[PDB]
Amino acid sequence: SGTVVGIDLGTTYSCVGVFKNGRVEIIANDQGNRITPSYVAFTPEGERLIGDAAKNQLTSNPENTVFDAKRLIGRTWNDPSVQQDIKFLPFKVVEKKTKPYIQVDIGGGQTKTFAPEEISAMVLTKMKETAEAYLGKKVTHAVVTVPAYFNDAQRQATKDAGTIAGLNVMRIINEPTAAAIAYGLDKREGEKNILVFDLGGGAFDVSLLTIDNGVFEVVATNGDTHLGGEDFDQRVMEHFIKLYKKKTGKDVRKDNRAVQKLRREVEKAKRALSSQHQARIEIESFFEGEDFSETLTRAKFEELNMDLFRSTMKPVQKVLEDSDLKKSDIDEIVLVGGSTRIPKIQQLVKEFFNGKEPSRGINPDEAVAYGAAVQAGVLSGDQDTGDLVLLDVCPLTLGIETVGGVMTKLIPRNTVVPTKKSQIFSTASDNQPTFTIKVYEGERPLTKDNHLLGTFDLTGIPPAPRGVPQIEVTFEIDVNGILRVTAEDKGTGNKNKITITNDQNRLTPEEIERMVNDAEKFA
């Protein structure tokens, strides 16, 4: 175990902390920065850059600069969200095993295709090195945070990224729950309901917790894993690409340098508009050696993003309805993420809660890593942590597809984890030897309107008439929020039990070992 570190693996920015001598220390990287861009780059000279160095050369080497991996992991190729992001990403995204893989020139002519898990593993490696420099020794174990609304595949993909970075991921912790610990650790005020509103670079969570002298109880959660800073930047970038088309007749998408130069300036302008009412977008040699000069007003920034900003209120109403709590039952609103500095976001939250000011106890950039580090301290077992207890939930209803494409629900959304649910099923035809167990995440009554978690082949069902075999299928969600599917013949049968194999649509143990070994040659 050694020294267990807490890592906020963020869409745009990552952060690492360690619990030592009674308190959390957030660790500055080799540049003195307490947050690190979730960026990797391969220079023409074959040099692998991670963090500030990788982000800093984005505009001169865009094709071989990789980011946004957190919005690629645990997704299929044809996910509309993946296709959305491709339009604003400078690196090649190729279909491999019906999943988005990243193709880059690593140097000296030769290319390389990466799983998005491998990009996140590189970012985890950088955060680990950051901790190791500070600690002056090796780091083998970590707590890594994920969005509360992360699905099963996105959670496992984050664990796999940990494995590929040579980290033992002791626990996956939901980001709002981590932020709740950062808020609540120093509070000896008894029972409070807090509304954690976490709008990040890429994912949006709302979690309603009851916190109580060391107990962190998630009552309800609801979010969107593809809503954050990235989308606000894309809306502004698209506005100026069309404006440039309007003014010059030239299409900016013909140049990745131009598109990513706009992204860089759009980022700076967005941050400026959180304290100023306008920002000048200035790019030298933007496209075909011609300069770009425009103004972005706060009003225009808000107009371009108003539907997205307003949409952040839906999960707030959802957790209140799910919890059967009134607005007045919320004791504190806890804002997390750089995006919560956007005045219009603060205004919408404050107005929703009839004038109530959000709390100022937390750093919105460091709170998630702070919480990860505290839980890492607890699991380390040697840090004089108190009786800290997380009672977290699954964000999505888990079901099995039954005859007629029916969502047969086993585990409702907001069920406390770990949990176990069993149901007995039977065959649809005579002598059927197999169940094709299709597990779905979502709240809709038909599986076609829900998200496929995985396909599990159950074989060895003895020959019998249709609807006779009594096959108990069990869903177990573990303390990481990840599903295990088992099955049992409830009747008297032979020694040779029915067996379950997962779909091969997630990284195989062989594939992971290869990626571990490949990563060790840059470690």
Add this chain to the structure above:
Amino acid sequence: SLEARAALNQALEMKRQGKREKAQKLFMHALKMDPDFVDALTEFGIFSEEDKDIIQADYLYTRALTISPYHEKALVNRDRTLPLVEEIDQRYFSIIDSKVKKVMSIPKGNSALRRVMEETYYHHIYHTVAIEGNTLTLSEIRHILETRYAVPGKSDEEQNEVIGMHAAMKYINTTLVSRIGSVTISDVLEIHRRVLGYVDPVEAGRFRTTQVLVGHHIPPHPQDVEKQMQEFVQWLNSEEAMNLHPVEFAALAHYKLVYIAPFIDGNGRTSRLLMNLILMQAGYPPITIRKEQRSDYYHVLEAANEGDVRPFIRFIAKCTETTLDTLLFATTEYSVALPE
């Protein structure tokens, strides 16, 4: 587990404050983190006892002591609940005994009783085969046995299971129920030979020669079945067994036979018939475990595998009460009054 100990400590603090919903949640979290956490099982027992759930409190103290037999707190707690649970379980047997007498109190010229007994026969076959996954309907079963014609487009096996059960129940009621003397292995084999005879004539009336599995239960190796069955029937005919309340005896007989699982198949059907033979030999009506109770049935059988058969005894007692309530409701006479 450090996490388990933290959850238990918080559970006790929340209980002290009167936050009982939160305490319950933390007890269950502690026992998820460490299912064999003796202190958590014991304290969760005391929590149950505060809610006047003596059976659950006692179940948890007993479970604690099966893990840690010399645990001082668990021993003191169990020693308190032991007599209270005996009082509760015996009181339920008394209520059942009163309802058996109410059935026997039904006048000899009650038309509804003969109707209900006939219907109850087909009902028993329906539930005993349907538990095992048989898809034949009550009306299809009545048709098979009365007309002796195959129901069209339904499997040979399912129909042959129903014929077997009918054959077995006729044999029991005509040859065994009224008969004086010990219940032998040969009697159990004759029952099984009828249960499985029309489906699997080779295996019908003989012990398995192979290892089988029974859901989560691993029964003895086929080589040990003869010896375990000899110990079983010796117990069936023992003074100790005949001093038990008939419902406890019938329930224990059921469990002991499915534990051994001496046959390749039909262990459930055979054991439910043996349970009803014991009840009827004691003057109790035959009882039905309904197919809808299947999950509860497996759950209490699993609790017995883990070393407490009492949930199974209480489940069989509840099935007995339900059978008696059904007979009594169906044979109620609604009096006619003079306006006067």
